[PDB]
Amino acid sequence: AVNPNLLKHIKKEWKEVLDIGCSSGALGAAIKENGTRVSGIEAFPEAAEQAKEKLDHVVLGDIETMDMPYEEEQFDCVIFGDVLEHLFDPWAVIEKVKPYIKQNGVILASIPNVSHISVLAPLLAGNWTYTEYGLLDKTHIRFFTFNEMLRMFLKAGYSISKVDRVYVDHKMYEPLIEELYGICKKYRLGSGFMAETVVFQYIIEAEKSQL
């Protein structure tokens, strides 16, 4: 299923895109309508076999350990749509893909926010309940806040070009959110609690750079 939040960041002029976790290839198929050549990587065979008939090149494999059958500087964009939190070493994976990105190409990543009020309220209630879907999806094994997203990309030698915030309804939580913000201010806990606890996911464009 496409993340509609990602498609709006796809540039029509891109020539080559790599979709990491391409599933059955629906996002790539959409991108291909622009003429862009789309490569995908998928770990589940049934999905990878569907993607093979839609995309230009598909690997059935694990990004964390696979050989990379691409040219240096092949890709305008490498997409991590709701992937990084499923990997054991996401930090290593973003460095691994870097040589395959063009000069001034980008990573486009959608990353769930662990500081979202829907995780923080139950945690205060004494719960960390894994679910079929959502922020505590049972297949999620890594967690990130915005600060940690920024650190991850910056330390891998990417610069942050764009940040898009995806919000969900949180009207019921507002009073709780305002009281918690009072405690952060009082206790000098960070900055941006209010701006960040309402963000469900971040879409980040990170441009290839150096340290």
Which residues of the chain form contacts with its own copies (CB under 8 A)? Answer: 88, 114-115, 120-129, 141-148, 176, 179-180, 183-184, 186-187, 189-193, 196
Contact (CB, 8 A) for 85 and 143: yes
Using DSSP, state whether 11 is helix, strand or coil.
coil
User: What is the CA angle 145-146-147, rounded to 5?
Assistant: 90
Nearer to its own copies, 35 or 190 (CB): 190
| Interactions with Ni ion, residue window 70-99 (CB under 5 A) | 82
Task: Enter the tokens of residue 164.
Answer: 């898009």
Nearer to Ni ion, 3 or 34 (CB): 3
Query: CB 186 → its own copies: shortest distance, Å?
Result: 8
In angstroms, what CA-CA distances link 9 with 3, 19, 20, 61, 150?
A: 11, 13, 16, 26, 18
Q: Which does 137 bind (CB under 5 to 8 A by kind): Ni ion, its own copies, none?
A: Ni ion
SS3 of residue 44 by DSSP: coil
CB of 46 to Ni ion, least distance (A): 17
Rule CB under 5 A: say whether 192 interacts with Ni ion: no
Binding partner at 133 among Ni ion, its own copies, none, C-beta below 5 to 8 Å by kind? none
- Among its own copies, Ni ion, none, what does residue 125 contact (CB within 5–8 Å per kind)? its own copies
Closest to 79 (Cα-Cα) out of 142, 30, 145: 30
Determine phi and psi for 6, rounding to 5 degrees: -80, -40
Under rule CB under 5 A, residue 207 binds Ni ion: no
CA distances from 108 to 14, 204, 205 (A): 13, 6, 5
Site string for Ni ion, 11-50 (x = CB under 5 A): ----------------------------------------
Residues in the chain: 211
Tokens of 207: 């441009």
Q: Which of 49, 56, 73, 137 binds Ni ion (CB under 5 A)?
A: 137
From its own copies, Ni ion, none, interface partner of 189 (C-beta below 5 to 8 A by class): its own copies
100 vs 144, beta carbon nearer its own copies: 144
Which residues bind to Ni ion, rule: CB under 5 A? 82, 137
